[PDB]
Copies of this chain bind each other. A is one copy, B any other.
Amino acid sequence: SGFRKMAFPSGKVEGCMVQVTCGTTTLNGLWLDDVVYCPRHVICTSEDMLNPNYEDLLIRKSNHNFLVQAGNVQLRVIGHSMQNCVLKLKVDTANPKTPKYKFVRIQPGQTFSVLACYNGSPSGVYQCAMRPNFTIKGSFLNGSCGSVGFNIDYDCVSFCYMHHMELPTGVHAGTDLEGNFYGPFVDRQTAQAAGTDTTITVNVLAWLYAAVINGDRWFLNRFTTTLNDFNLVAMKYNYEPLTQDHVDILGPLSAQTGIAVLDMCASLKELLQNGMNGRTILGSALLEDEFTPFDVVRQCSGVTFQ
């Protein structure tokens, strides 16, 4: 029993974190096979970050301006290119520890583990969600750039995130590992808006299901509702519209629990209109939306490796 914000075991991605230095800036880089991925703003100086002409800065750079080291071992750089906002550094040595891996562009509402690094060395793992507005509520100090987000499936690391910047609101933004930002962001030290952040309704329901599974059942109603009437309630409260594949995705949880999805939505509507009245659900006084249905099932089922 019990439900926790659980990150993936980080051992596979640990052996992939390197230090990438270019002049005074040091960032983290991801060493897979014989290429090192890192945020391209490693090539920026003190001033360049207001509005960098990245191709023009990269031209001033040669292979030997890129100090990359894995722990103590310095790797020789035999090639560099820029793919979108990511620098790809070809190195002579294949990482002896590259795991089976995929690059994937995750979708909003999906979660992933972040291995927060500084100076190529790991300092912590936590779980977070790609918000609907394509930001993450992370914990990133200076030098954390190039820290990566990932999922594990069997022995397969699925890298989906590389950290680039902090916004004015204090949330975080970053790219997929092909260097394309999630969201409308650009890697400049400029004021950039994220949109309104909506709540991931299907995740909240999955967390209500985990709550029922774990004994928290006070919020269970005697009511029901309809997709459309709940969806009018969702829009009042900046909740993403619940759709028919959402109820289908909750199917396993609905069956394992014997609570129809729309009975759960009607429970959620009451929580949204009457608050929690100072009660708690799974040790929280807020509605939690960083648990996907798969997170719940994996945790309430104990799926290993992954």
* Set of chain B residues within 8 Å of A166, measured between Cβ atoms: 1-2
Most B CB contacts (10 A, CB to CB) among A14, A144, A276 go to A14
Interface positions, chain A 1-42, Cβ under 8 Å from B, are 1-12, 14-15
Cα of A140 to Cα of B71 in the assembled complex, Å: 34
A278 to B287, alpha carbons, bound, how many Å?
A: 13
**How many copies of this kind of chain does the complex include?**
2
Interface residues of A in 269-304 (CB under 8 A from B): 275-276, 278, 280, 283-286, 298-304
B-chain residues with CB within 8 Å of residue A283 when the two chains form the complex: 137, 286
| Cβ contact within 8 Å between B10 and A214 | no
Give chain B residues whose Cβ lies under 8 Å from the Cβ of A117. 304
Total residues of chain A contacting the partner, CB 8 A: 57
Inter-chain contact B2/A118, CB cutoff 8 Å = no
Distance of A290 from chain B, by nearest CB (Å) = 10
B302 contacts A143, C-beta separation under 8 Å: yes
Contact (Cβ within 8 A) A125 B2: no
A9-B124, A9-B125, A124-B8 known; A302+B2 contact, CB < 8 A: no
- B2, B126, B138: the one contacting A7 at CB < 8 Å is B126
> Does A119 sit at the interface, judged by CB under 8 A?
yes
Interface residue ranges, A against B (CB under 8 Å)? 1-12, 14-15, 115-119, 121-126, 128, 137-144, 166, 170-172, 214-215, 275-276, 278, 280, 283-286, 298-306
- Beyond the given A7-B125, A139-B299, could you list 7 further A-B residue pairs with CB under 8 A, ordered by the A residue number? A6-B116, A6-B139, A8-B124, A9-B14, A9-B125, A117-B304, A125-B125
- CB pair B11–A15 under 8 Å, yes or no, is yes
Chain B residues near A215 (CB-CB < 8 A)? 170
A118 to B121, CA, bound (A): 28
Complex contact B118–A302 (CB within 8 A) = yes
Alpha-carbon gap, A124 to B215, bound state (A): 22
Using CB atoms, name the residue of chain B closest to A284: B286
Q: What residue in chain B is nearest A306 (Cβ atoms)?
A: B123
Chain B residues, CB < 8 A from A14 = 9, 11
